[PDB]
């Protein structure tokens, strides 16, 4: 029981922490572009996607090999708890 | 001032006795009034010597002297209803002391209590001390078991007793101990879990046989 509680607490923790850096690197560049639009008046609502695509695709570029060694380290542990 | 005015408002619960060794004994009657008179003599509002005595603890004080200078003595209790002439309840069927030997004990017990004048030694029977304990234990309709042996008897009350049979037993033991004291007969009230309150039988081939009283008991499913 205490491992079923631990494995459920860690699956939600890894979802929270792996979707952390791409969702805070697409937030500062969602807010500072609009703060530039508060100084100079622009009425183009479809503007900060041009930076949001480069922000998410460059954050997923440097940490690409890092996600594989957190998914493999958690996926090998849960099967050892399953079988043994 | 005098000692019998430094105590409380009523001069009815204490009693001031003059000692032979130039002391002043205060005769209380219980433990709550013993600390009432010992607080007065402890804080020191009396310029002379005084002591606070009691029936329960000067009966324990001269039992320490007695099993050093007179061992293997059979006796019960010392009664202080008149504190200038105490009564020494001695056993009759277990002593070998003669008339000349009882007077030395009567003088050597007088020398331990300087307030007393003369100790009156009387002899009680050993079978009326256990007959009154068995007739009183049967009048309350209590389950019990008597164990006779040489030099004392014992009464054992076991079982899953209810709330009335503990209060009726405890009210009788503390009223018998005040009269006789626990030197000869001793009660052994104890609670365990078996609805057969003390008794135990074994069953085979003819009916039931009453087993001997032993320490092991069968735990009760009910």
């Amino acid at each position: 029981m205490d491992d079923l509680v631990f494995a459920g607490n860690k699956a939600l923790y890894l979802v929270l922490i792996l979707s952390g850096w791409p969702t805070i690197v697409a937030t500062i560049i969602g807010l500072l572009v609009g703060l530039f639009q508060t100084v100079t008046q622009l009425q183009e609502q479809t503007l900060p996607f041009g930076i949001k695509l480069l922000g998410v695709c460059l954050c997923l570029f440097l940490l690409s090999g890092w996600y594989g060694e957190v998914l493999l380290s958690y996926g090998r542990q849960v099967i050892f708890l399953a079988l043994a | 001032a005098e000692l019998d005015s430094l105590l409380g408002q009523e001069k009815e619960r204490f009693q001031v006795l003059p000692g032979r060794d130039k002391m002043l004994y205060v005769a209380a009657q219980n433990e709550r009034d013993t600390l009432w008179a010992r607080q007065v003599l402890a804080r020191g509002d009396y310029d002379k010597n005084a002591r606070v005595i009691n029936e329960n603890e000067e009966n324990k004080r001269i039992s320490i002297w007695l099993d050093t200078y007179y061992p293997q003595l059979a006796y019960y209790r010392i009664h202080f209803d008149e504190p200038r002439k105490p009564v020494f309840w001695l056993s009759r069927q277990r002593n070998t002391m003669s008339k000349k030997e009882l007077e030395v004990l009567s003088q050597k017990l007088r020398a331990l209590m300087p307030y007393a004048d003369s100790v009156n030694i009387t002899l009680m029977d050993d079978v009326t001390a256990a007959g009154q304990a068995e007739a009183g234990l049967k009048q309350q309709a209590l389950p019990y078991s008597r164990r006779n042996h040489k030099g004392g008897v014992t009464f054992v009350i076991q079982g899953a007793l209810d709330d009335v049979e503990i209060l009726r037993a405890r009210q009788f033991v503390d009223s018998y101990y005040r009269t006789w004291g626990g030197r000869y007969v001793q009660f052994a009230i104890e609670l365990k879990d078996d609805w057969l309150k003390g008794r135990s039988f074994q069953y085979g081939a003819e009916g039931y046989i009453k087993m001997s009283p032993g320490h092991w008991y069968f735990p009760s499913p009910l």
């Binding site: - | 009432w36 607080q39 804080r43 020191g44 209810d162």
Partner: protein, 184 residues
């Protein structure tokens, strides 16, 4: 002269006075406004007064009820947190109902708490009770153990007469005379 307790409450001060006056030392209760009461004694009575404070564990703690640890201000309320608050008001209403009998000065009732039997398929266990009481002296307190058993029996779902255990006693000897002033 010398203080031994201060900052006490109202009901905490009368217990310390009633304890010290039983043991022949006279104390004084002084009010200090919003800072509570204070209790002083004389010079020769101080050594005995610290000894009876230490022995009797004075000042008394406030009495605890089981409904104090499950407060009603929480917007969530588990079924373990509703039956415990339901039991804790029954064992206070039965205690307040025992003091209106003939000759009872105080009483204290306890109930067996069952909270985890209904959550699974297990049947609920039987309920047990226990009671204490202090009777006015002059009472035959061996025949009043069956009126508390009769009153406490069918005030609940289904008890037996073995599950109720009441043990009671008579009150102590009355203290009426004044302590007395330490003269030097």
């Amino acid at each position: 002269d010398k203080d031994l307790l201060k900052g006490l409450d109202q009901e905490q001060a009368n217990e310390v006075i009633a304890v010290l006056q039983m043991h022949n030392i006279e104390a004084n209760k002084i009010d200090s406004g919003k800072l509570g009461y204070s209790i002083t004694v004389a010079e020769p009575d101080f050594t005995a007064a610290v000894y009876w404070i230490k022995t009797y564990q004075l000042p008394p703690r406030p009495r605890v009820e089981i409904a104090q640890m499950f407060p009603a201000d929480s917007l969530v309320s588990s079924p373990r947190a509703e039956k415990a608050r339901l039991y804790s008001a029954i064992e206070q209403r039965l205690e307040q109902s025992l003091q209106t009998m003939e000759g009872v000065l105080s009483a204290r009732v306890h109930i067996s708490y069952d909270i985890d039997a209904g959550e699974n398929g297990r049947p609920p266990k039987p309920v047990h009770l226990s009671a204490l009481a202090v009777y006015e002296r002059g009472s035959p307190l061996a025949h009043q153990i069956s009126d508390i058993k009769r009153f406490l029996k069918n005030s609940f779902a289904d008890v037996d007469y073995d599950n109720i255990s009441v043990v009671l006693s008579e009150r102590s000897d009355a203290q009426l005379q004044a302590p007395g002033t330490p003269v030097k």
